Amino acid sequence: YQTKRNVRREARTLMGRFKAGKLAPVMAVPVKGSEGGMLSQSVSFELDPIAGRMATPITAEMCAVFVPVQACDALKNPEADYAGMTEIVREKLLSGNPLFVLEPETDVSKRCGVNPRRNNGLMRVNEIVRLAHNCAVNFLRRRRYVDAVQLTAANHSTTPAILSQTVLDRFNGALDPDPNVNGAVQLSMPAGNVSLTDFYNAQKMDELTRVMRKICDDNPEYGEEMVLRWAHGLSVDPGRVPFLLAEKSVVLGRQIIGATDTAGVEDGVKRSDMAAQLSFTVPIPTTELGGIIVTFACIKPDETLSSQPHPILADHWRLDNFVADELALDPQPVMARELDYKVAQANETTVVFYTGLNELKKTYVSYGLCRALDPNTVESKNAVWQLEVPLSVTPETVLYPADLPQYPFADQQAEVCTYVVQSTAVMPTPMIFGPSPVEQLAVIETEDLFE
Amino acid sequence: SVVLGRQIIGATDTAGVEDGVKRSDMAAQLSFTVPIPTTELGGIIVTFACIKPDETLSSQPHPILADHWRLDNFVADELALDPQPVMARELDYKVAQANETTVVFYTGLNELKKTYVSYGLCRALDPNTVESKNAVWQLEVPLSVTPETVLYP
Amino acid sequence: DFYNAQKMDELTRVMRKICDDNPEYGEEMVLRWAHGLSVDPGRVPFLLAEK
């Protein structure tokens, strides 16, 4: 066995809606052990009508994450020791009991399009779909930032979207600089001496801790543990972690339809319709046990800071001593007053994250309206749909706000988008199948042909 | 046979544009030219025509995710060499409580897993919405009962 | 029956070689081989030279 003998293929088509600013799952293709082949998926996008034209771009998203069976077991039994190991999963499968058992329906399972099973007059679906979604969204959060909030197995609803760039990553800052980089050297003083061997063992510890930072950052999964094993000369088990299959994005197009009646023409009534099409075709990974390829899709607005004080004109005009500037060689604190103007009075003077010397002046990108303009006007031409993040508080946040108001659409709380998916999978498999049966013949028994 | 084309006509008034009013018109043309058969007595060439929706099972449980996750003994799989019964619980989720465990038709070993085609809406979506863009016109056959049925409802 | 057998005779003989060609993991890899599983490689010893 473990060889390709027969073939199974699947072709699922689904339609639905999801709310903007949320990482809505679209489908979940199951993969068994020793299954590999081709997987082609395509997602259409259609948004509800928007008054006026929308110069602000809207981006589309599509992701494909392969969640192995090993990772789903860890969420099911986190406190259990060696829960995620392959052999532990391997032994439980051989026991004859099911590794994953049925559960009631949930919003996560419904959106994937897993049709339920009628058991004892109740709908039932396997727990693997819920665990796979929770692990997949967790995996995407580690990519933007390793120390990110991670969902448990108890989640039963759609999750918020994920930012494309964190505030700290934008300004390349740090909440807390380490004490080793440009650190302290021990001093003997029992007439004393700092000794020449300390500060020599250091001055590479500064170099050695920085390479330790990249090994736990280039690989967000196994982070804060592979560095432990890397120092001792050990390696992690590869199969547990998930991995990414494909990523697609495109700015939604715009089609303008104008009114023609007398009242509409005089006022200037018009419409903006958005649509997009994305697809990918990637091979299916082959594993001894198997997994699920959870697909995601999302629509997000432009991520630009409408509220950020000007680093030059907002603060005082000063003659800078460049001699002292090059002499710092140390992180400089940043207050919330420098990040936005929507700051509370108490939090105006509060260190939020450390950064370099002249950071927040190297780059300054701002998109938004003029402060003199009244937002009640330009209900037509209302193009400004941008994430009005509070900022300052939780700079390291990786997730979108739980409630994102959809201003340009008529209904804020309605699922504005409508999507149609077409997933086609061809999976060579080691499955056996069997011969087809036949139908009863009423000429042989009623005449005794085979006498 | 041919798939009917689609022509989209959109509204232009103020109320229609804001709501998103629009129309879909369908049309088709088919023809044939064949010789008339010759017979001693004769006959009648009855012509038929019909329009039907897509025939895809919107209601069918997933052969993998709906049922339990099991490690399959391929040794016993090749050893069967016999028809395996199928219950109505494996064909759809609109089954009555009594008919959940009732053999409906015998098949092979891993049938219902070789192929799985499904077209329909998401269970989370509310059908009262999308009265516009209402594209889902598919035969919602009860299934299970009368699997050998040849005729439409 | 006798058709499911007459390859069981063939199928048990291939099961004998997989547990004989590999004495280590014997009587267990045949269990995993039927279900489509594999053993962890690093545990077992192996031979270097013979003279």
Residue numbers in the entry:
A (entry chain B): 3 to 192, 250 to 510
B (entry chain B): 308 to 460
C (entry chain B): 257 to 307
Study authors write:
Here, we have characterized an exceptionally large microvirus, Ebor, and provide crucial insights into long-standing mechanistic questions. This phage, infecting a model aquatic Alphaproteobacterium Rhodobacter capsulatus, belongs to the microvirus taxon ‘Tainavirinae’ and recognizes the host via five Gokushovirinae-like trimeric protrusions. The capsid exhibits the triangulation number of T=1, being made of 60 copies of the major capsid protein. The core of the major capsid protein contains an 8-stranded antiparallel β-barrel (single jelly-roll fold), the fold shared among all Microviridae.
We isolated two Ebor variants exhibiting different stability during cryo-EM sample preparation. Thus, we designated these variants S120 and R120. Variant R120 virions were purified using CsCl gradient, vitrified and imaged using cryo-EM, yielding stable native particles. The capsid shell has an external diameter of 28 nm and an internal diameter of 25.1 nm. The internal diameter is 3.2 to 4.6 nm larger compared to other determined capsid structures of Microviridae members, allowing Ebor to accommodate larger genome. A striking characteristic of the capsid is the presence of elongated protrusions situated at its three-fold symmetry axes, reaching out 9 nm from its surface. The model showed the tip of the protrusion possesses a positive electrostatic potential, contrary to the negative potential of the capsid’s penton exterior.
